[PDB]
């Protein structure tokens, strides 16, 4: 069809419907998995995970996408697990998640070469199977546009002119990286509407957050829930004056919530601090009843969780 | 029972016999590998590792030390097959080879809990196995002594203290990390000769690797053939003229051969010209033989590759 998905027939961008367009099945640091296994439980992460995706589609949510990549521990074995205990449509993605600089094994590779891991996740399968990346996930965040963070950024702008699948982004709301993100891949060539900024919502800059938009790509107000960024009723605030002034065309909503992840900043005790009320289905409990008691109608809801994750994959 | 073996019984440090210190049977990123598996071919890795062992072995070489650790792709079970296949006496190690920044995991967790990964690797077992790690590594280079670098130097110190292990660092000659890692540990209470501070041999400055050689470490002259780094000739006559300086009883030598690596460095079109003659045994072929036909008598052989790893190792 169009769009891959995790242990199904790929599907037509018309039948994604309600979609979740970040969150992950499970986070961790690849490295140390691998070399400290003793860390981790296999089997507490499936129950996490696919409880989380239970209650999700018991909201009617049809689609997850999920950019989780290297570095954040993609593993779609695991991913396919959950797909076969759920039902859910599950988009997998390639790219590469890095602050700074990119694993050794990059030295003196180019940026082609980079590219060319993308597009195999992409036309080939993900480690070994079959099933296929719909789209490229990249990073920025407080170290900035680094040189291999850009050559990252560049290699997605390759992958999406040769697959024509869209870019979801991390970035860090505070220091210009979502807008330097959209710049470069831009110029590379890439439509300025198959790009998702992400993590626009940890600020209630609206200034910043439009000039994204007004550039044509949408705007992540994907955080909802991680109080530590920015609190609920903020976004709740931002994300309606958004609204009100006419950016649903590019408005897209979503949790990032990770139903386990290994970094010693989550972990039960900071949580009730950090993130109390962060889960997969927060939106459904908060974010949409308050925009609708303040006047947003089903149609709007409709474009921002239907429509825009469309137009995004087709 | 005394240094703990890959797939084998525990030895005395007094029989560990001809010994190459740092040597990898296979070199890889962790997220890369994990990430795209058709880059790897496991049958080559294997057969190299094997066939360059065992030539090592011809040679008289009876134990090959692997700082291979999280960060460069350590396989427990990959270096027991090799062990199989070969009888030789391999010694596996644990800690973490960074640069820069530790992983995600790592975010707001103490040198403590990094000190307890260590341990756990020493005293319970390497990935689910009971192959133990008879050493910790750590590393530093060009970026210097990081804040997490740090960390990872000072969880090693806490392990060689609680495990009596030697720790082997990976250094840069050319910007004092090697010093600065020798300050800090012994700073914290390990005793200068558990400690070999690595890639010395990469610079023709006498003075500055006299002057660790001096504070009581070993110091390593671990990198013959890898030119890009100083070439053999040059590498030659350090080593004889701190042998003549009466620093036998401080030095190791060693090839820091990669069986297999996977960085785009590595690679055959620029073995030509970073290193040609790079292989397990090229000490054999050129090293020893020059030291020996230049006043090096057996004695002080034995003392490099016999003695001091010994001294190390108990
Ligand atoms: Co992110
Ligand atoms: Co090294
Ligand atoms: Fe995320
Ligand atoms: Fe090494």
Redesign the interface.
């Known amino acids: 069809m169009r769009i891959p998905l995790v242990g199904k027939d790929s599907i037509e961008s018309k039948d994604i419907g309600f979609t979740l367009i970040h969150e992950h099945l499970r986070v ?5 998995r ?5 860390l981790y439980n296999e089997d507490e992460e499936f129950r996490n995970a696919v409880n989380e995706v239970k209650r999700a589609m018991q909201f009617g949510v049809k689609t997850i996408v999920d950019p989780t ?3 954040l ?3 779609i074995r695991f991913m396919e697990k959950v797909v076969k205990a759920t039902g859910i449509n599950l988009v997998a993605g390639t790219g590469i998640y890095i ?3 990119l ?7 180019s940026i082609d ?1 980079i590219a060319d ?1 993308f597009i ?2 992409i036309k ?1 399968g993900i ?2 199977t079959l099933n296929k990346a719909g789209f490229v996930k990249i990073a920025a965040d407080e170290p900035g546009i680094t040189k291999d963070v850009e050559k990252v950024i560049r290699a997605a702008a390759i992958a999406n002119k040769e697959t024509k699948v869209p870019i979801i982004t991390h970035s860090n709301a505070h220091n210009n990286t979502g807008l330097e993100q959209q710049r470069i891949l831009t110029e590379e060539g890439v439509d300025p509407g198959k790009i998702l900024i992400g993590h626009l919502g940890d600020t209630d800059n609206i200034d910043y957050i439009k000039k994204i938009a007004d550039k044509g790509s949408f705007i992540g107000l994907d955080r909802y829930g991680l109080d530590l960024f920015l609190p609920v009723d903020k976004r709740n605030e931002t994300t309606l004056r958004l609204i009100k002034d006419g950016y649903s065309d590019k408005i897209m909503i979503s949790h990032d919530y990770c139903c386990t992840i ?4 989550a ?1 039960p005790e ?1 949580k009730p601090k950090l993130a109390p009320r962060w889960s997969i289905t927060l939106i459904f409990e908060d974010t949409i009843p308050f925009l609708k008691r303040n006047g947003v109608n089903e149609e709007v809801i409709a474009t921002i969780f239907k429509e825009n994750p469309k137009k995004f994959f087709s």
Not at 28 to 32: G, L, N, P, Q
Not at 34 to 38: C, G, L, R, S
Not at 103 to 109: E, M, Q, V
């Open positions: 961790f640091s690849e490295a140390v691998q070399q400290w296994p003793h990549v290297m570095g521990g993609r593993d602050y700074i600089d694993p050794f094994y990059f030295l003196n590779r070469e891991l195999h996740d080939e480690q070994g290994d970094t010693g900043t972990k900071y």
